[PDB]
Design a protein around this ligand. Structure first.
Ligand code: BOG
Lengths: 124, 121
């Protein structure tokens, strides 16, 4: 089922149901900063249990509204706290009580400290 | 049912609440959306799935405010007919069988789901 989703969205990328209304960019620091702070104030990620599908609904909402390619929202590997690889995005996945139940949590410090970078230089 | 519990939880109000106010699906709304999707969209020819229908349902729910409880079809086997009158897409088999979204403008004037299955009304 995991692989079946990738092939579906890449077919869907031209186009489904409508191609996005705005010019189609890649995710920036400031965009990711504004969208996070937006989603806290108005809208509701805070607390929700993470899933492959929910992330996709969130990725597609940003893609259709703002035009940012859904290529961006990636976190560090487990176990434990799951840090965003795209700097600017102020959400991380915390466990709640080796795969485990995660939760989107806002953290304004993520704006100033690229914690994924500091813990895993591997990726850069 | 693993999806429905997640979907219900989400309904207040992930990822944002839809911007235009909520209202139930109508004949004309369904008609207009269908004819929009054929001209300026890409629902045509695409293989159906549970997730693809949900992406479509949520795009409508967010864009236009229609609660996603309207785009259901008749049971199989064979040509799968829309229960909501106005919606001009049906799911045709390609040859549990592989279905494809197909625009049919005659669905606007004949409630084929009604004529074949009066049990649902
Ligand atoms: C799976 C999620 C599908 C995408 C849902 C969000 C798409 C909404 O899209 C936006 O809707 C606004 C009104 O709400 C309009 O003003 C914008 O022009 C439009 O881009």
């Amino acid at each position: 089922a995991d692989c079946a989703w990738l092939e579906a969205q890449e077919e869907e990328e031209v186009g489904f149901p409508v191609r996005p209304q705005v010019p189609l960019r890649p995710m920036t620091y400031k965009a990711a900063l504004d969208i996070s702070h937006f989603l806290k104030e108005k809208g509701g990620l805070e607390g929700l249990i993470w899933s492959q599908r929910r992330q996709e609904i969130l990725d597609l909402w940003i893609y259709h509204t703002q035009g940012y390619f859904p290529d961006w929202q990636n976190y560090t590997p487990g176990p434990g706290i799951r840090y965003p690889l795209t700097f600017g995005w102020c959400f991380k996945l915390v466990p709640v009580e080796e795969k485990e139940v995660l939760v989107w949590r806002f953290d304004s410090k993520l704006a100033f400290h690229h914690m994924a970078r500091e813990l895993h230089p591997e990726y850069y």
